[PDB]
Design a protein around this ligand. Structure first.
Ligand SMILES: *[C@@H]1O[C@H](CO)[C@@H](O[C@@H]2O[C@H](CO)[C@@H](O)[C@H](O)[C@H]2NC(C)=O)[C@H](O)[C@H]1NC(C)=O
Ligand code: NAG
Lengths: 49, 48
């Protein structure tokens, strides 16, 4: 007959607590608007969003 | 004039390990959505 798999009985979830936010909304909503000729790049890492 | 007795050995293969392969456990291990696409290939899973 066909096969079978052992059904899980729990769930493991691990994350890094007390981590600051990425505050991406403040970067997009800025008064200084760039130009397509001199566009910049900002890297978001080690934060929550 | 003088003789002796010699001994030789020979091996002849008569058997082979019997392997068993199936469609489910080889292609779609535990994914339910994987078996949906295998339904179209229904006949091409029993001839194997
Ligand atoms: C909008 O963009 C400007 C850049 O033109 C940001 O001003 C910089 O702010 C950082 C602090 O976060 C300073 O270290 C830099 O010296 C500033 N650059 C300047 C004054 O040219 C500004 O923070 C961004 N956000 C807002 C809300 O204005
Ligand atoms: C044959 O060879 C064996 C081996 O040493 C020996 O013992 C025997 O005497 C020999 N016989 C003759 C007839 O030469």
């Amino acid at each position: 007959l066909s096969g079978f798999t052992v059904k899980p009985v729990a769930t493991v979830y691990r994350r890094i607590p007390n981590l600051p936010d990425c505050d991406i909304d403040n970067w997009l909503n800025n008064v200084s608007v760039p130009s397509p000729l001199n566009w910049e790049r900002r890297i978001f890492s080690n934060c929550n969003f | 004039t003088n003789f002796t007795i010699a001994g030789h050995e020979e091996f002849i293969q008569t058997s082979s390990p019997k392997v068993t392969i199936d469609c489910s456990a080889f292609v779609c291990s535990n994914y339910a959505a994987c078996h949906d696409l295998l339904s179209e290939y229904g006949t091409f899973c029993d001839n194997i």
